[PDB]
Structures are given as C-alpha cells and as structure tokens.
C-alpha cells in the first residue's frame with residue numbers, strides 16, 4: 001500500500017530501454033502490472049534474481065523476461081497485450097503501440 005511514485009521511471013536492463021510513466025497508466029489496477037507473487041503483492045524489479053531472469057530470444061516460459069512484457073497468451077497481462085487489445089481499432093497506432101520500430105516503447 002505504497003504511493004504511486006512520481007513519473008521518471010524507465011526500464012533499460014536489456015539492450016532495449018523503455019520508459020513508462022504511471023501517469024499514462026494510472027487508470028489500471030496495480031495488480032495488472034504488479035501481480036501477486038508467492039502470495040504477496042510484488043512491486044520489485046520485474047526481472048530481479050529469482051524471478052524473470054530469462055533474457056534470450058527464443059526460450060519462453062513464465063521465466064521469460066520478454067515473455068512477461070510482450071506475449072498475450074500469459075496468465076497475466078503484458079505491455080504489448082493490453083496495447084493489442086487497445087490498438088486493435090486502427091492499423092496506424094498498431095505501429096506505435098505494438099510497433100517494433102518507432103514505437104513509443106522501442107522509439
């Protein structure tokens with residue numbers, strides 16, 4: 001039961017830095033991004049040691065770091081998923097929300 005920190009949070013652990021402001025995501029259940037782990041809401045690094053440490057281009061599974069922030073066929077929502085369920089009305093933003101290059105995430 002913390003307090004939505006002030007914007008200015010960016011994730012760049014891998015070879016792809018992606019900024020994310022809670023402001024642009026302050027209308028979503030914290031439980032959407034911060035899923036309950038070991039039966040206890042977790043708000044620590046998504047990756048961290050012990051959790052999503054998998055950082056390869058192939059191997060999937062829940063351990064998959066890029067699989068917990070892309071794939072939509074997961075237990076929990078991702079980043080591209082929600083975006084997919086959103087950027088599915090126009091074939092324009094689809095190249096921005098789910099875009100690979102020039103996208104807000106991978107801009």
Ligand code: HEC
Nearest residue numbers: 011012013014016018055056066079080097098099100105
């Ligand atoms: C177009 C469909 C996409 C391609 C191709 C890739 N993504 Fe993303 N992406 C996002 C985040 C938040 C991360 C993790 C940041 C971090 O942990 O540092 C990533 C990471 C990747 C990676 C690296 C995975 C690895 O470590 O091997 C690859 C290869 C990758 N992404 C390819 C965020 C987003 C995002 C925001 C909504 C979108 C639309 C996409 N990613 C889409 C693509």
Ligand code: HEC
Nearest residue numbers: 002003004005011020025028029030032033043044045046
């Ligand atoms: C995705 C749509 C998110 C929602 C919804 C909320 N948060 Fe979040 N938060 C998110 C990320 C990607 C990160 C950084 C992790 C990373 O990959 O680097 C965070 C970080 C926090 C933190 C920092 C951890 C700490 O020091 O305690 C806190 C405290 C936090 N977020 C709080 C929070 C609250 C209260 C939310 C609902 C009101 C909430 N987050 C939603 C992604 C997302």
Ligand code: HEC
Nearest residue numbers: 033034037042044045046048051061062068074075076077
């Ligand atoms: C260890 C304390 C973890 C941290 C930190 C994060 N997650 Fe996680 N996640 C963890 C486990 C043990 C599992 C598997 C249990 C399950 O619900 O299947 C997961 C699963 C996910 C998934 C589902 C992927 C699938 O294949 O179904 C996603 C999409 C996911 N986790 C995303 C995610 C995000 C966005 C995180 C940071 C806010 C995050 N996880 C942190 C353990 C841990």
Ligand code: HEC
Nearest residue numbers: 018019020024025028032077078079080082083086104105
């Ligand atoms: C629904 C539960 C979402 C999840 C999960 C994530 N995002 Fe998201 N994002 C969502 C919406 C509805 C929007 C607004 C799109 C619009 O302009 O109408 C966004 C926007 C972004 C942006 C763009 C910033 C902006 O234009 O204000 C970025 C860069 C972004 N989202 C990144 C992002 C990341 C990194 C996520 C996982 C950590 C993520 N989103 C999850 C809805 C949802």
